């Protein structure tokens with residue numbers, strides 16, 4: 001929709017063939033697929049990723065591509081392609097895909113109460129904040145909240161337009 005948020009982002013992604021169901025929650029496999037396409041990675045049809053849990057499905061060669069490019073690791077217990085992706089995992093995808101750690105000077109400050117107490121991925125969220133890719137709300141960044149398709153489009157369109165090649 002025209003005056004609706006996300007439209008310039010989604011058009012950018014459509015223009016680059018990387019993506020309406022904007023409020024739909026995104027799975028980790030769908031996020032990885034958007035990455036594989038925006039990065040223009042080579043997609044070998046029968047290439048398989050390492051992960052036992054990511055075989056035999058439409059997303060499988062896309063996951064293999066972003067694993068080969070170093071963009072995804074597992075969770076440690078596989079890739080969990082059909083689990084919903086949360087914001088801190090999204091951050092991890094973008095930081096790895098675009099080497100965003102080389103785009104900031106030193107270590108970004110922590111600007112949110114709920115990034116301070118985080119088990120993993122604090123640094124990656126802070127980098128997104130530092131780069132203004134995540135605007136962030138008030139005093140909560142909500143690292144474990146799931147990402148919608150339109151929110152993913154914004155993160156990716158914004159990041160790629162700035163740092164893509």
Ligand SMILES: CC(=O)N[C@@H]1[C@H](O[C@H]2[C@H](O)[C@@H](NC(C)=O)[C@H](O)O[C@@H]2CO)O[C@@H]2CO[C@](C)(C(=O)O)O[C@H]2[C@@H]1O
Nearest residue numbers: 071072073074075076078079088089090092093119120
């Ligand atoms: C192996 C590793 O450290 N992975 C990180 C992360 O790994 C977490 C566990 O989630 C996490 N497991 C749980 C159940 O929370 C574990 O406790 O700590 C690991 C880090 O020490 O998992 C992310 C999953 O999503 C992506 C995009 C991904 O690449 O799939 O990014 C991963 C991070 O790189």
